[model samples]
Target: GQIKISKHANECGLPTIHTPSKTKLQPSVFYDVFPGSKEPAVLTDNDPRLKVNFKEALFSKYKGNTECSLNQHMEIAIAHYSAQLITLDIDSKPIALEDSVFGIEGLEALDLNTSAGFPYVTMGIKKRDLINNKTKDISRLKEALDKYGVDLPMITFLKDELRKKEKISAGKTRVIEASSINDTILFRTTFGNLFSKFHLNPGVVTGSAVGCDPETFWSKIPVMLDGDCIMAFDYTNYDGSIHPVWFQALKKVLENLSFQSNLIDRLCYSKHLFKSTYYEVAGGVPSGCSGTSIFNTMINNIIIRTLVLDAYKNIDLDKLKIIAYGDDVIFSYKYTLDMEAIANEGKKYGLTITPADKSTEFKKLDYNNVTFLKRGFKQDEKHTFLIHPTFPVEEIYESIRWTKKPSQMQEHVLSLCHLMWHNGRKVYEDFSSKIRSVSAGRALYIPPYDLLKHEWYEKF
Candidate 1:
C-alpha cells in the first residue's frame, strides 16, 4: 500500500513533536478512523501508554490508499493504526510488546468475502439488546434495516445513515453464513462428540469456519481439480474469532492424500486432477497412530499422502514422492499402473479411490504449466492462473513447476482456510455433523499396500 499524507496536520499541533525534556514540536494529539468502521475516536489520549499522537502518526504517514485498488479505505485504516503503535520516542522508547495489549502482526490479512457474515446471525448494521415480551425471542439487531418492522427502543438504535434512510437491508450482507444448528452450545463442543471418532481441520471447536466432514466435501474436489473458478471458501460467522491454524492441518492433509490422488490422477488421465474443499474448518481431537494434533488434520494429511505417495505394498511409501495441501495432493510420476492396483486394494482399510482427476485433451485445460484439477485464480487472461482452490491463502508453496506468484499461493491457501474455519463455531453441532452415522456403516481399516515394510507399519 502507498502512504497517505495528512492535508491538515498543523491544525492538530503535530507539525513537530517534543518529549518530557526538550520542547520542540509539542506534537498535538489527533485521531483517525478505524477499519471497516465509520467513526473517528480518541485512540491517542485514551491509551495509558507513551505519547506521540499515536493517532496522527498512524494515519498521516500511512501508505495504504495506494497498495490495493479494491479496499483502499479499509487498508489505509489498518495500516495507519498499525504504524502509530511503533512510532515512539527513545528512553521512553516504544514499550516492550509484552507490556502492551496489542500483539505483533506478522502479516496483514483480511477477507472481505467473510466480511459478510451469515444472515440473521451476525453481519447487521448495528448492535441492540432485544427483550420483547410479545415474541419472547430476543434478537440482536446487527443491521439497521432489520429493526425496521420491529418495535421497541431497540428500533431507535439504527445507524445514523440507516435511520435517515427509509429502506432497510437487515442481514443483507449475510450472503455467506456459518453452518446452522438447532442448539448453540452443543454446536461448539467438538470435544464432546466427534473429537474421538473423526478428524476436524479447525480442531472441531464450535466457532471455527475452517471445517468440514470431508465425507461430503470430497465429492466436489475433482470438479475443481479439473480446473474450476473457486478461489476460497469458509464459514461466515459463529460469532467468534477467525481461526487460521487449520491451514496447517489442511496443508498436512493434502500432503497425505495418496490413495485419493493416485486414484484420480490415473482415472482422469484424460482430464485434470481437480480439487475439492469443505466449506468449514473442523477440529476436535486427534485420532489413531498418526500423532497429529487434530483428528481432521491427520485424516486429511493421510488421505493426501496416500494418494501422492506411490506406495506399492504399504511399504513403498518411503519411495513415493508426496506433496499436498489439505486434500489437494499431486504426484510427479508419468506412469501409475502399479500404484493403481495397490490403491484399489487399499480401499479395504476404509480408504476409497475417488474418481476426481482426469487428463482430457482440448477439453478443460489451459494447456500449460500445472494443469489444474481444481479451479482458482488464473495467472493471466490466457487462463494460465493457478488460483487457489479455496480462500485467499496466507502462506503456501507452489510446486517446482507452478508458475503462480507467491502472493497468489498465499491468497489461495488463506482464502480456502478462512472459508472452513470461519463462522461455524457458535453452531457447529446444529450445522450438521455425522460421527454417529459411521457406527452403523463403519468400514474395516485398510493397511497401506506395503504394510509390513518397516517396523512402524508392522504394528501400526
Candidate 2:
C-alpha cells in the first residue's frame, strides 16, 4: 500500500502550513496573502517608478568618509576578497585556482531532489551523469562557463573527483516525479539550480544549507539603550528578476574570479512556464540553487559596502552594526533613516526594498523581545540575552501525526526531540509515551542526551 503523506507537504519536503496554530488556512486565503505566479513580474531599470541619486541620497551627508571602515570581524563575515570588484576591466586578474576550488568545496552540497531549468535535469541524475562523464548536460553547462571565462581543466578535474568520491548507481530512471493530491501538484526533482520562494522562518529548510546562519549574524549585536533599535528589512521578490545590464556588469567582474558561474549562468538563461504561457526568466539568481545563498550574500555585502559602509566611514563600527544575509538585513536603529535613503537609491538598479512599515522594527525599550535571524534577543537590566524563538511544536506534531510511513514517522519524531532538547524543554517522558502510542513500538525513542558526548567517551 502506498503510504499517504500530509496535505501540508510541498515540493520541498517541508510543510506548507508553517504556523504554530492547528488551523490550516484555506487555499484561496493562503494564495491571497502570499500571491505568486509562475511568471514573475518584470521590473526594468528604465522604469519611471525607479528613482535614485546615490550621490545626493547616500554620500551627500557624509562626504569625507569615502574609505571602507570594516572591522576584521565584519570583513570576515562578508567573505572579503582581495580584488577591485566594481572595476570595468573584463580581463582582470582572477582568483587563484586553489581559492576557486576551496570556494566550490565550501558550498553546500546539492540535495537529492531539486529541479533545474534550461536543461531541466534533476540534481541526482545530474550528479550521476557528471560522474559517468556524460557530455550531454555537461557540454551545455560548460558552454555557459566558457562564456564566463571559467577554467575548463578545473571543471574536468572536479568531475573526475566527483566520480571518485560518490558511489552512484549506473541506471536510468525518471528524473522528475509529480503527484496531484488535494488539487496541489507536488513535484520531486533535484538540481544545482532552480527558482523558488525564500523561506523567512527558521527550521523550514531542515538539514539543508539554504537557510541563514542566525547566530553568527545576530550575536554581533551588543546591548542597546532605550532609543537603540533594530530594523529588519527584506527585498520584495528578491530572486524574481534582476536588472539585465547590472547583472551583465557583475558577470564581467565575477568572470574567472569565482565558481559562481557554475550556478549563475544557468540562472540567467533559464525559462519557465505557467499553464499555457511560457515565461522567460528575464534576470535574477535562482532561489533554489545550492550556491544561491552564498551568491546573494556576496551581492548584498558588496551593495552594503558601497552604499552604507563607505558612506558611514566615520561612524563607530560597534554602534553601527549592520549585517545582511541574502536580502534580509538588520542594523542599529540610528541608521533607519539612512537605510530608507539607501532603499530609495537601490530602485535605479531595479532593486525593490520593502517599506519599513511592511517590514519589522524593534526598539530596546519595547515590551516585546525582537527576533533576528530566528533567535530572540531582549534586554535584561543592562545586557541582552540570546534565547530561542517560538518553536513550532504544534506544527511538527501535526505533521508527525499525519505521517504514515514507519521510517518517515520516526524521522519526524527525531526532529521534534532534537528541537525540544535544543530549546531546553524537558519532555522526555511525554515524548517517550507519545512515540510508543503513535508508532505502536515501531519507532525507537532515543533520548537527546544519548546523542551527545559523554564524559567517559572523552578518554577514548
- At residue 185, candidate 1 shows an lDDT of 15
Q: Could you tell me the TM-score of candidate 1?
A: 0.23
Worst 10-residue lDDT window, candidate 2: 152-161
* Candidate maximizing lDDT: 2
Question: What's the TM-score of each model vs. the native?
Answer: 0.23, 0.46
* CA lDDT of every candidate: 0.24, 0.34
* Per-residue lDDT of candidate 2, residues 1-460 (tens digit): 0111212223423222211112121122112222222111112222232244311321111112112233433343233321432221222233332222222222222332432222222122333332223332344333433443321100000011111101122111011111111001111112111112122222211101135443332332443322255554557655543444334433433553432433344444433322222223345554443345545554554554434543454444334444445665545544333556556555545566754324453223222444444444433232235422334343334334433244454565676665544333354455455556533434465565545213212322
Measured with C-alpha atoms, the lDDT of residue 238 in candidate 2 is 59
Candidate 1 accuracy as lDDT:
0.24
Q: Residues 1-460, candidate 1: write the lDDT tens digits.
A: 1221223323432222211221111111111110112121122234333334533432221122211121222233223322321232102122221111111231111111221111122333211222233443334322222433221110001111211011111111111112111111111121122222222322211111123323233333333233231111111111111112222333322233211122111111111000111111122111111112233333333433333333432333322222233333333232332434434533333233433233222122222323222423222223222222322111111111121243343343333223322222322222112211333212312222233123222222
Q: For candidate 2, what's the RMSD?
A: 16.8
Best by TM-score: 2
